[PDB]
């Protein structure tokens, strides 16, 4: 049959590995987008 929506995205070791190398490549660039004193 057919279903309405995509289900909850289950957290697998592959998706936490992609999130961790995303964030460690990001802070190896040190490209964190915070606010500024302005």
């Amino acid at each position: 049959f057919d279903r309405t929506a995509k289900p909850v995205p289950v957290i697998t070791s592959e998706v936490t590995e992609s999130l961790e190398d995303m964030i460690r490549r990001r802070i190896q660039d040190s490209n964190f987008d915070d606010l500024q004193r302005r």
Binding site: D2, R3, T4, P7
Partner: protein
Amino acid sequence: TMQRSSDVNERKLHVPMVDRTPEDDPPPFIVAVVGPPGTGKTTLIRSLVRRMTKSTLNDIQGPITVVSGKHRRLTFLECPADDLNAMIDIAKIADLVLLLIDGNFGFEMETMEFLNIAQHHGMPRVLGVATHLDLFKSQSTLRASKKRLKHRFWTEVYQGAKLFYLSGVINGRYPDREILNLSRFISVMKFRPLKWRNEHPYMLADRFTDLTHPELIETQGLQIDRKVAIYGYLHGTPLPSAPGTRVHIAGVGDFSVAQIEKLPDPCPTPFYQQKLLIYAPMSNIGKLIYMDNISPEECIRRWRDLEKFVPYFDTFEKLAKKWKSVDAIKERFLTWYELQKAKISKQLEINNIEYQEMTPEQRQRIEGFKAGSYVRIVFEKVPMEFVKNFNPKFPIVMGGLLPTEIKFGIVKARLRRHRWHKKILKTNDPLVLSLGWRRFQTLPIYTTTDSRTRTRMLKYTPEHTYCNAAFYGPLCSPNTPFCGVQIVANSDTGNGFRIAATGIVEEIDVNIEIVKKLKLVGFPYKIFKNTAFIKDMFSSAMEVARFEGAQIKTVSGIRGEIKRALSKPEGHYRAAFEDKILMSDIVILRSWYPVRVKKFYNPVTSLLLKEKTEWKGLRLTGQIRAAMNLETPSNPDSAYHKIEKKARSFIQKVLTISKAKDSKRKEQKASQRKERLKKLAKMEEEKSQRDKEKKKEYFAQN
């Protein structure tokens, strides 16, 4: 008139097709006298043989091969006018059809069924013979019947066909002037190529013998599947001479050939090729390679392991030293339709010019009895009832099989109820098919792609247009027409038509996925706002736990997923919707259960019965229901329905009439004001697009 000069020479340009009718021994062009019972056939045959060989023929039976003219001869066949089991394969084999109508009766449905079978299976050269003009002295009515028959005939077949009229019979034979002006036409015949008779080796039988041992049948006792010689005359593509070819003769099923043999020709060639007449029956290195005994290396050493792909090689140093100088290899080193016709005709010419070579290879073991060779065939294991109740009236056609059309399995065709059949075709109601050479009763399933995403099962064919269909059966090649008959027995024909389903096979396979939409159905019983507990569609929480997440919709058109099973009332569960449902609604899933086609297959096996007709195969569903007298299964909640003081009293009556009259007059004026608004919308849209065309046509002069 240059426009007409460039417009009438588009009659020439057609699809390029190939012929394979060689100009050395052309076969007798099988013509096929068919039509109604009673009128015509035997007297027309007697007249044609009496005018073509000056000798009569009393009690004619089976196929004649008479000679007409110098070069080539032809073949007659009185087809019986009581069975489609002869009519169908006569229309599959024939090349001309002189077709009988009787002008004191109008048309007739046997020639109607024959013309439709010919129109689908490939049009032969049709030629109408209107007989039985004993109409009246009123030559106005004679001209009227001939005019109406000619116009109806030119609509049914190509417009402009010849319709020869015959008067009454003068002592057994027809008027000889009309037989003269018919015989001159069928001498100037000029046939055309067709794909089936230019793709399959086909033969009409005209002699039929049983060369099985009389002591063997007398000691086995009428049980054996005997061996049978068909002495016959092949047409079309060359039937390959090596024994082992699968050949289906009609109405018993296929066999394999055992041995075939070329005979003396019982019909005239020209007399110069004779030196340097009605026949009416039923009344080095190459042999070094192909020698089996010797090994290949002993073969090459008498003349002078391929998983390893690489070609052979010598010693690297040896051929490098040989080819330190390489000048030994210096001798090597340094309109559209007439175009296509020239291409295929030059192909056929070089084919013939390298065929004209030594005779055992180039006639009977490289290509095998091209066309026009009186050959005897034998088959062992031919069943008993064929020879026990063989009838000389019925034709015995036989076509070879291509390597693809012996396999079985499903086939997906396109279908359409034949537009004069008075009743539509329910699915899983069996019908006879003339798919190729085989004719067989099978159970189809009519499907359609619902806007080309999935193939669901219809419970009925559409009423006038096509639909897909799938059925078990012999896998013919794609892109071929086929007719489908209902009941073939002449005990139930009555007054109605017989052909049911024309169509075209386009695609074969071995397994088809095909669904049927079943709808799960439940009811709500505690309706909240925006959610509802729905009831008695699932017997258990395990079913609900599989189906959690599905789109359902009510009958009102509101969607909504289902979420989770309720706990204690174990059938019921909880769903969320668009907004609040009424209690009087029905929740509906959507679901597909894959149905599978039935593997039934039964050929007609026509000419094995004692009766030669009345082949009751499987009955229709309606008539077995009427046979064991069950009623048709109506569903009582499924039937449609047509859904849904005197002065003061007088003044109240007048006011309550007048305000309601003016109310509905006002709403009618508003209703028609809506259509006046839509009409002005269409008018302004057309005017605006016309003016925005004109305002740039005013600027394209720049």
